Amino acid sequence: STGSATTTPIDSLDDAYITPVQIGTPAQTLNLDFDTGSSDLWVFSSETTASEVDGQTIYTPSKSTTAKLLSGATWSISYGDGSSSSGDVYTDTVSVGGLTVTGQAVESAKKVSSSFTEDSTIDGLLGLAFSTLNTVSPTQQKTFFDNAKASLDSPVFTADLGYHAPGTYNFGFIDTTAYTGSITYTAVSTKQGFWEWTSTGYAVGSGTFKSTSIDGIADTGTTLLYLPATVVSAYWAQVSGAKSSSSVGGYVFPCSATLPSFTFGVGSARIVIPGDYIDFGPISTGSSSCFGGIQSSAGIGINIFGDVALKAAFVVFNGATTPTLGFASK
């Protein structure tokens, strides 16, 4: 079997992407953030403390004939940006774009941090990293992809994120009409539970390509591109008037500047990020200082190929017994 679902940016800056997911019987449709950097499927629910819900659609397990409380199970997650949530666990039927999985662990949020409360367009997250990162205790649970793996035509899913435009998540097949050229596959390390790979270098604008190994993770759940301080400094040095701001917490640049493209290497292939993709607009309403889409990973501890990078490519997440990542131009 296969599945295919449209994913939509939540705002005009592509800060995140939401994808409708059907949960329960009868279906309760929620718009979830598909996150290849985490492994928990959690949702706002009727059990979430009311003051922490502001416009989100909630999952009501009592209205689902297939929902079952997973007795004694709890979950607690904290993300790299400081956000966190926790609650209990149900099992229910979950369908993504026609692809259905029974007995999927649906983690009901009882408490959520303020960054989720203020994001009224995101009803939850669907984790697509490896299941070793799942936070359910005492019995760890499998991701939606893991549970669907046996039923898929091919054990893959693909991410085709749009720039200021809708995109597609596909499960179980590779759409050969959605990219150009050939797909370049590269090795994945699962040692930390992430879709971790090694980029072969970078280039700034029309500069010479610098061959150097950048270890990082492909993370659809992170907005920006986080790279070592040496690379990021070399990029912003080409933008007139750009500087790192401590009060803003990153590199900013004059909104009147034109940004150079950024190229990253996948084996012998090259993925080019247009400079327009790196503009994230004024730091405040009316400001003439703009926030940059490429930032340093020094404080994070890990390099993150977030949406800024991934939306420039067609990305294959190959979940075979030896997992690989595929990148193609589009």
Ligand SMILES: NCc1ccc(C(F)(F)F)cc1
């Ligand atoms: N990468 C996990 C993640 C995804 C989304 C959010 C936000 F922005 F919606 F709060 C935080 C953390």
